[PDB]
Amino acid sequence: KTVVVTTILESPYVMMKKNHEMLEGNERYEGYCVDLAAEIAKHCGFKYKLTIVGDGKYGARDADTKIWNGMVGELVYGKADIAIAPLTITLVREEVIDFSKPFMSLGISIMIKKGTPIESAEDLSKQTEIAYGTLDSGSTKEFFRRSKIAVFDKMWTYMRSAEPSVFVRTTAEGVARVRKSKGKYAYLLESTMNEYIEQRKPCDTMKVGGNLDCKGYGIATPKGSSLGNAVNLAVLKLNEQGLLDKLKNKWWYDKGECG
Amino acid sequence: KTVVVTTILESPYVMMKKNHEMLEGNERYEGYCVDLAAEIAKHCGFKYKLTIVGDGKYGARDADTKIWNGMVGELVYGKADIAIAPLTITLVREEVIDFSKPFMSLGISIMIKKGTPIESAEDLSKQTEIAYGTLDSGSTKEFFRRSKIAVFDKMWTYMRSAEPSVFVRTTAEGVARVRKSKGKYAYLLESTMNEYIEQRKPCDTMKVGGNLDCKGYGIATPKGSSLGNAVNLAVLKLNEQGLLDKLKNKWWYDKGEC
Ligand SMILES: O=c1[nH]c2cc(C(F)(F)F)c(N3CCOCC3)cc2n(CP(=O)(O)O)c1=O
Ligand SMILES: O=c1[nH]c2cc(C(F)(F)F)c(N3CCOCC3)cc2n(CP(=O)(O)O)c1=O
C-alpha cells in the first residue's frame, strides 16, 4: 500500500538533485514539496513514491473533450493517489477532486527592475512610459481580461492592444524582458514566483506593492479518498506549528542568493 | 438530536424581523446566515435551534485567563454545537475549533464619503489633508502594525502618531465619522460591511480601491464534532451551486436601497 504521489518539476517546489542520475526513487528530488510530502506522509503514516506528472501539466479539462489533464487527471483517472504540488485551489477542480486547507497563499504581483518608479498596479495604470504585460496564456492573463475593477480593466485595455505585444511565452521570457528593458518593462506573475526570482542572481528584480487577488495552493486527493481527512489535519497542524513557514524560508531565503 | 446553532446579531447576517415579538423560535430572525443555517441543516439532515451568543462577541482568548469568550467559547466549552456566523478563519481560533472551507471571502477595504478624491490606499499614504483610521483595536489596526509592504507601513507610521486620534471606538463611530466629515475622514473596515453600508440609506458612502488582504468567514464546529465533515461538504456544494453568491446578492443588493 505504497501511496503514489503526483507532482511537477517547478523550482523550488520540486527539482532534480544535481547528481540525480546516480540516485534512485524519492532521492532524485529535492524542494519545498519534496519536504512537504515527507511531513504529510509522516503525519498520515504512509510510505510513498514521488512521480512527476506525465504530461507536465497542472490540470485542466481539454476544453471540448471532457477529459482532465495534468495532475488533476492523474487523480480523477486513478493514476495517482495524492498530488503534493503548487496546485491552485479552484472551483472547477473542486468539482472533480478534493483540496486540503491551503498550504500556501499567493496572488498576482508586479515585478520590476530595481529602481523602476512603480509601486503598485495603480501606478502602472496611470502611465505609459513603462510597458507591462503577463504570460501569453493562463490565469493571470485571464484575470485581467474578465476583471471589471477599473484599474485592472484599464490595464487589460492597455495590454490587449499594445504593440509590440507586451505578453510573453514563458516566465523566463518575462523575467529576461524585465532585466533587459532598462526598467521600462514590468511583469505580472504569481507573488511566490516573484519572491523566488528576487532571491536569484543577479539580484536585479524586485516585487512591489500588495497582491492583486487571493489564491491558495492545496494538496489534492481524488473524491472519496480515504486520505482526505488525515491530509487536511496534517496541513492544519503543519501550518499551526510553523513548519510551512519554515519550509518557505528554507527554499526561498536560506537557499537564496541575494539576502 | 436538535443541534444548537450559535450566531451573532450582525446586519445582514442575522437580524431581528420587524415583528420578532410576534414570532417564536427560528422565525424571529432573518438574514444571510439565517438562510445559510437552513441550507446547512437541509444538506446535513438535522433540526436546529438558533441562539444568539450570550456575550455578543465573536471569540478571543483572554490573555490572563486562557478562557475563550464569544461564539468560539460557546463551541469549545460545550454550549453550542455549531457556529453559523461571519466568523473569521484564523490560526489562533483553529487551535481550539474547526472551520469549514470559507463561505465568504473578504478583506480590509477603504470606505469613503461620496465625492472624496481618493481611489486607493497608496493615495491615502501620500497625503494628510484627509484623515484616515480604523477600529481602535482588532485585526485591521493589527494588520497595519505588522505590515512590511511599503505603502501599508507608511500608513501605520502616520496613524499611530496622529492627533486627534484617527481610531474609533465602534464601527458606528467610524461610519458616522465618515458621514460627518463631508469627505475629510476615511475609514478602514471589512469589505463585506463596507459593501453593505453602501447599499443603505442615506447612500452617501462607497467602497473604494481593492481589498488590502485576504480573509475568510467559515462555519465553526467543536473539535471532534461529527458534523465537521458534513458541514464542509455542504459549504463546498453550496458554493459550487452558486447558493452562497445568490444569498449575497439577496441580502446585499436585492434588499439594498441605493
Ligand atoms: O494550479 C496551478 N498551479 C500553478 C503553479 C505555478 C508556479 F508555482 F508558479 F510554478 C504556475 N507558474 C506560473 C508561472 O510560470 C510557471 C508556472 C502556474 C500554475 N498554474 C497555471 P496558471 O494559473 O494558468 O498560471 C496552475 O493552474
Ligand atoms: O470573527 C470575526 N468576525 C467579524 C465580523 C465583522 C462583520 F463585518 F460584521 F461581519 C466584524 N466587524 C463588525 C462590523 O464592522 C466592521 C467589521 C468584526 C469581526 N471580528 C472582529 P475583527 O476581526 O477585529 O474585525 C471577528 O473577530
Author numbering:
A (entry chain A): 4 to 262
B (entry chain B): 4 to 261
Source paper text:
AMPARs mediate fast excitatory signaling in the brain, and a change in their number or function underlies lasting forms of synaptic plasticity. AMPARs are homo- or heterotetrameric assemblies of the pore-forming subunits GluA1–4. The activation, deactivation, and desensitization of the receptor is controlled by ligand-binding domains (LBDs) which form a self-contained clamshell-like structure within each of the four subunits. Following glutamate binding, closure of the LBD clamshell around the agonist causes separation of the D2 domains, applying tension to linkers between the LBDs and the ion channel which opens the gate.
